[PDB]
Amino acid sequence: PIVQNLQGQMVHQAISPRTLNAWVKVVEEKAFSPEVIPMFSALSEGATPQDLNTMLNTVAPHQAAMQMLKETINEEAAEWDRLHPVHAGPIAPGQMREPRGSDIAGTTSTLQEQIGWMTHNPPIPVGEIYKRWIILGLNKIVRMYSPTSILDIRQGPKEPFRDYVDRFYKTLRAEQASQEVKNWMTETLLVQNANPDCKTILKALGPGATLEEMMTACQGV
Amino acid sequence: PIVQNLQGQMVHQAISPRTLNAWVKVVEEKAFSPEVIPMFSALSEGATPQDLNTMLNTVAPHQAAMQMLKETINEEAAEWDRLHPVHAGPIAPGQMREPRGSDIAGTTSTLQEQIGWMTHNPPIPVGEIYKRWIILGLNKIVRMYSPTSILDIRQGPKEPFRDYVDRFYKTLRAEQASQEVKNWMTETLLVQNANPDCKTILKALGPGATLEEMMTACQGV
Amino acid sequence: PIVQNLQGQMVHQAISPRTLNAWVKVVEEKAFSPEVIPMFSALSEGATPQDLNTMLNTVAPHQAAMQMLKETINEEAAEWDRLHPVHAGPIAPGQMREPRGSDIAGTTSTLQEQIGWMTHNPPIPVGEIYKRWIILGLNKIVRMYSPTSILDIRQGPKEPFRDYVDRFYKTLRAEQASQEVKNWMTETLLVQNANPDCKTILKALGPGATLEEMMTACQGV
Amino acid sequence: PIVQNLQGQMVHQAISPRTLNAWVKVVEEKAFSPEVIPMFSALSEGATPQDLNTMLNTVAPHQAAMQMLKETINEEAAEWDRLHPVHAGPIAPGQMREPRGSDIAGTTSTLQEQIGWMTHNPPIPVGEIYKRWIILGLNKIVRMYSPTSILDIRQGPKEPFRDYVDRFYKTLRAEQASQEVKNWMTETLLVQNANPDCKTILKALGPGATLEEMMTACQGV
């Protein structure tokens, strides 16, 4: 992250060892469950590209996930270079240069360059964009590691309705289908795969019933 | 680690008690699993040789692991002395002397010497090299304590494919074979030791199929 | 082969009918076992490219093996042409021209050309190189026809250790893995797949035990 | 071998392809049984060191046997060099030089040198000595590959006595014990391990009975 010294200047501060260890525990203990993404977003709050690469070093022992992340990052960097062509000409002495795709990811840039780029009026967030690319890669990884399809999430004969709903929505978040497909799933498949008693109640409830009404009507069933 | 005082001078800061306690919990509770190495790397982030020896004091009650670490450290120090002979002659007043193998490990050096050595332009990282030697020793220890061979990692009849892949790759990381041998293992043994249904599907998939394609084709099997 | 006439001149001699019949028996009766390669090497001893094509005519009824051989030969001829470019310019009257890839295989050359090329001071062996290409093709064929993986070679409960070792090494020769992979196989998999009594003895024997020591310790078990 | 041309000069003749194929069949089909040694002696009759190395090329795919052969050959060559020191001084123009250990094995010598060395009055057999070294190596290999100890050769309850004697003596030839130990074995162990009826008859026959008398007395038992 970025901190201010006693002289009022923006200075980079390294990630604390226990934050890095929390990230390591998340990587090594949760098997790339969907909750890894909110935890990564929280643990990398206000980070620099060098800090993000330090956090990514934890993923390196997982070859498939790391390769997927690297492919996503390279594609995003190529797209960034395509959409931000290197202008040929003079540059104002008071204005800093434009970083490239290899520079936002911190492959060739330095710490001071990123500190200056992030701290500006108006600021151009380089850490946030790299973080978003990491999140795209992580979403792909979570999709790859998902053990069950949404079509295989069925309510147990004695399973409470709220637990079935939680499992269903967790699997839906893992799968990351299209928005229209997701809406169709939440509207139709959730009712379709319920157990007979809750299914009868939900059918009696009618189409267009909100999730709150369904959980109310199926609370003790 | 190294911190800056109000006067702008680099000053050593001791490891916080809770970071040391986290390291103690890792040592005493995980039985030298492969995840001990990323956790040690995170918890010793930006540390000095004195801090590294403080962290190593936790390993001392484990006689075999500590002896293996000491052997690896002594061998690395001897190699460092061989590759960095003590030059006989004058030394510039503004340039500090060259530490020996017993000095990078902090056996004979002092805190100020290591602080000066690490904080330089350009810097010579003494903490990182000692840390790498520790990691070599820890890798040897993890290999020693591994309970199962990779040849004994077989998918259960009802075990999901992703869990089998995770166990297989964790054992592979523990064993630390040669790169060519590791590639052969990931290409052949993973398919060989799968359960009959996934094995049939993977055989139909053909050689050279990526891990993502295999996990996709075996998701619900 | 090449023989000398009464005048001291090198003359080509055709392969005897019974040598050709021995080669035919090898091709038609052994199902491309690994021993086909030493037998082909012995039976084609000191042969000319025309003789080698005569021997290859026996393989033609086997479409897959013959196609694999032709692909290997064409690739080797293309590589030979690439590494031996046709020089444009004068040629010494006493020095013969350089054969092409289609010429070493005897597709376009004549018998006298090959006789002169092989009989020279210093000699340039054209028959040996074509033979080596044939051996590469035959190795590929033997790999294709191998019925069992090395991972499936397991010592029987009452099988003598020497027979298990012979089967293991025959399969290893058939598979033709990389040298490092082969060393790992002979060091680890042979012990891993032995029966419980021999496995206990070999484990007690320790790593780095020679094959002779293992066969001595497991002789009557 | 060595043949004479029309001018009366000794000329080397290569081994015929079918003799080499017979040797290949012996190597690849008999699993280093004791009969491999008489067959090698017959098939290498009157051979040159180059011919012997050509025959040894068949053994190369068998790593353990080939390594044992190479160790025996190197030891014999070192002993030959020790017992035949290189004399420093003039050499007669009509007398050829003394080959070294690397020269009798054909590693550095040429065909003409060996032809001249073998064809002399009086002749110094270089092929025979190399052949004897090969036979020592092969005897070691046959000992290594022997599946049963002599102590485990026991006559079956209905096995004819002549077959038991043949198996016993074949195992004894494989084991190659000391002469006194071999005499003790043939005198005591053969009677000891016979079946009860033949054992009773042989005990009644008394010590010092010849093998012919034993086979006569046990013919139909």
Numbering used by the authors:
A (entry chain A), B (entry chain A), C (entry chain A), D (entry chain A): 1 to 221
The study reports:
Along the body of the cone, the CA subunits are assembled on a hexagonal lattice, with the CA amino-terminal domain (NTD) making hexameric rings that are linked together by the carboxy-terminal domain (CTD). Twelve CA pentamers occupy sharp points of curvature—termed declinations—exactly 12 of which are required for the capsid to completely close. Here, we identify a Thr-Val-Gly-Gly motif that modulates CA hexamer/pentamer switching by folding into a 310 helix in the pentamer and random coil in the hexamer.
To stabilize the 310 helix and thus favor the pentamer, we replaced the two glycines in the TVGG motif with alanine and proline. Indeed, incubation of CA-G60A G61P with IP6 induced assembly of small spheres of around 20 nm in diameter. Cryo-EM imaging indicated that the spheres are T = 1 particles, or icosahedra made of 12 pentamers and no hexamers. We solved the cryo-EM structures of these T = 1 capsids to 2.2 Å (CA-G60A G61P), 3.1 Å (CA-M66A), and 2.4 Å (CA-G60A G61P M66A). These confirmed that the mutant pentamers have the same structure as the WT pentamer, with the switch in the 310 helix configuration and the gate in the open configuration.
